[PDB]
Design a protein around this ligand. Structure first.
Ligand SMILES: Nc1nc2c(ncn2[C@@H]2O[C@H](COP(=O)(O)OP(=O)(O)NP(=O)(O)O)[C@@H](O)[C@H]2O)c(=O)[nH]1
Ligand SMILES: [Mg+2]
Length: 570
């Protein structure tokens, strides 16, 4: 991207995804660290975001008195500290002072920034006083804009998926002086979010936004920035060189950028899923569609929506893998059914592995069941092709090997004295030849036996004709031939029975292979979820302790409540 592009348009009160932007996202396959900035209009948000892009000329800037950015803009640039990663910068339409009304989608822009980011930067001018905290109603209001799941307490889940929070304070006017040594900006943020005792409406209003920031975001950070230049040059800031700006401001910006580059994490969804272009595109579509539908954007629903897409593709990818492996290894007709089934089993195992590693949230295992159904059909097709190839080969061999004999018999070559011995010897030699032919396939015994049985009268015809054989000797031969026919029948019957057994055995083995890989994936998913829950537990215990140490039992006890509820889910 040579420059930023609008990702979400905001026109006539409607938010809509920019198709051109979605197209760009579909092409970025690398993991993304998403940093979004929000705050009152004209507070230097776009200017600061251009610093992260590390380039002049990026997001367009406005004046110090008029709003500029509209909707949500994105700029995907290579991450300067993480090779193989993309840094996605989201610049947003400046918030208005609610105590003025209008600006309908302010809250939604704010909520989308929270849902789409890895790091959420709240930018304001001044200090953290009552005036500043009143504007944070936008954070308090998140409980009315975002839903964690669809299956006063839903917000208890926010800390598990919300971005890290960074408060950037512009034109900072405090020296932060304190007994001994000055407060650091992070200590100043802690000081600023401390609660006030009391149950009055005023007390509740003071504590609410502070509690929301402390409880909804997993990590908080603060950076202060001095006035960049003299008031008469603020409007030319973009064209000024670092040497023309306050040295401390230049260093503060450098420290902010360094922190972002070193601490902002790859955007992740439940299950450790790392968000890349196609995945972010899905989230944008789902959340914006929800808002456009008059519904609340829901994290759970978005993950599931993403699952639907990737799981469908996973089934197709697995089937493709199966077809490829079978095609590269099969030689028809196969020497035996075991040969074909062994190849099928191996290809199927690899295909299921492809599906398992490419899928997630396959509720009710519906997608894996679909895969199983498709592989079974594929297996049936190969089996049919194999039997057909065998039938063709064996019937062909029958023509090549036995036809000459049949014709000799019809020509009377064996109807002379001593012809029976010559005939039986020739027939045995020909049956041996048939059996020694390579890769006849699974129909070898059935094709031969059916033929030999249909021509049974031939043997008797030659026998009774030969005069060089006594009647007793002929009686012996008739019984010998009857015994050989019965043995040929047994070979055909066993061939039939064994094939059925092998098919049944393969059916059971395939079922067990699916179960094995599924059980293993479910186990891995359980471990990953518990790990995520343990992190949330750690974050909530931490806050509970801070609240108690701060002297607030009423709020600290409320935390213990959320902790108990989390533990019922573990
Ligand atoms: N006082 C002050 N002005 C700044 C600072 N950083 C940038 N500016 C100036 O403020 C004006 C607006 O900057 P811009 O980044 O467009 O602000 P914004 O927050 O993005 N406005 P909007 O939300 O409406 O899009 C420009 O003249 C810019 O030079 C700062 O730290 N302090
Ligand atoms: Mg702007």
């Amino acid at each position: 991207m040579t420059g930023p592009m609008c990702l979400i348009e905001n026109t006539n009160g409607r938010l809509m995804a920019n198709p051109e932007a979605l197209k760009i996202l579909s092409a970025i396959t690398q993991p993304m660290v998403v940093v979004a900035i929000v705050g009152l209009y004209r507070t230097g948000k776009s200017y600061l975001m251009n610093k992260l892009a590390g380039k002049k000329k990026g997001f367009s800037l406005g004046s110090t008195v008029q709003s500029h950015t509209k909707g949500i803009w994105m700029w995907c640039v290579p991450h300067p500290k993480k090779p193989g990663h993309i840094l996605v910068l989201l610049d947003t339409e400046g918030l208005g002072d609610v105590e003025k009304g209008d600006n309908q989608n302010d809250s939604w822009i704010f909520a989308l920034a929270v849902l789409l980011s890895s790091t959420f930067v709240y930018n304001s001018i001044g200090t953290i006083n009552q005036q500043a905290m009143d504007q944070l109603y936008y954070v308090t209001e998140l409980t009315h804009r975002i839903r964690s799941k669809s299956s006063v307490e839903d917000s208890a889940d926010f800390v598990s998926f919300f971005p890290d929070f960074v408060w950037t304070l512009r034109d900072f006017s405090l020296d932060l002086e304190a007994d001994g040594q000055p407060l650091t900006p992070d200590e100043y943020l802690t000081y600023s979010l401390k609660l006030k005792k009391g149950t009055s409406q005023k007390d509740e209003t003071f504590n609410l936004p502070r509690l929301c920031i402390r409880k909804f975001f997993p990590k908080k950070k603060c950076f202060v920035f001095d006035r960049p230049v003299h008031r008469r040059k603020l409007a030319q800031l973009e064209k000024l060189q670092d040497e023309e700006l306050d040295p401390e401001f230049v260093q503060q910006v450098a420290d902010f950028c360094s922190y972002i580059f070193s601490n902002s994490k790859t955007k992740t969804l439940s299950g450790g899923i790392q968000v890349n272009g196609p995945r972010l595109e899905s989230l944008v579509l789902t959340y914006v569609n929800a808002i456009s539908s008059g519904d609340l954007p829901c994290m759970e629903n978005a993950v599931l929506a993403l699952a639907q897409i990737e799981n469908s593709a996973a089934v197709q990818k697995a089937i493709a893998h199966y077809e490829q492996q079978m095609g590269q290894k099969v030689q028809l007709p196969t020497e035996s059914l075991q040969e074909l089934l062994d190849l099928h089993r191996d290809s199927e195992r690899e295909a299921i592995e492809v599906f398992i590693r490419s899928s997630f949230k396959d509720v009710d295992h519906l997608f894996q069941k679909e895969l199983a159904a498709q592989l079974e059909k594929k297996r049936d097709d190969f089996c049919k092709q194999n039997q057909e190839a065998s039938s063709d080969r064996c019937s062909g061999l029958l023509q090549v090997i036995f036809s000459p004999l049949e014709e000799e018999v019809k020509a009377g070559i064996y109807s002379k004295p001593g012809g029976y011995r010559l005939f039986v010897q020739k027939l045995q030699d020909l049956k041996k030849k048939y059996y020694e032919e390579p890769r006849k396939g699974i129909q070898a015994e059935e094709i031969l036996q059916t033929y030999l049985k249909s021509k049974e009268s031939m043997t008797d015809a030659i026998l009774q004709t030969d005069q060089t054989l006594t009647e007793k000797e002929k009686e012996i031969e008739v019984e010998r031939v009857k015994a050989e026919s019965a043995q040929a029948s047994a070979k055909m019957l066993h061939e039939m029975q064994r094939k059925n057994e092998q098919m049944m055995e393969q059916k059971e083995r395939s079922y067990q292979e699916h179960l094995k890989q599924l059980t293993e994936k479910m186990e891995n998913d359980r471990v990953q979820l518990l790990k995520e829950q343990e992190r949330t537990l750690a974050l909530k215990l931490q806050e509970q302790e801070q609240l108690l140490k701060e002297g607030f039992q009423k709020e600290s006890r409320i935390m213990k409540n959320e902790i108990q509820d989390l533990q019922t889910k573990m």
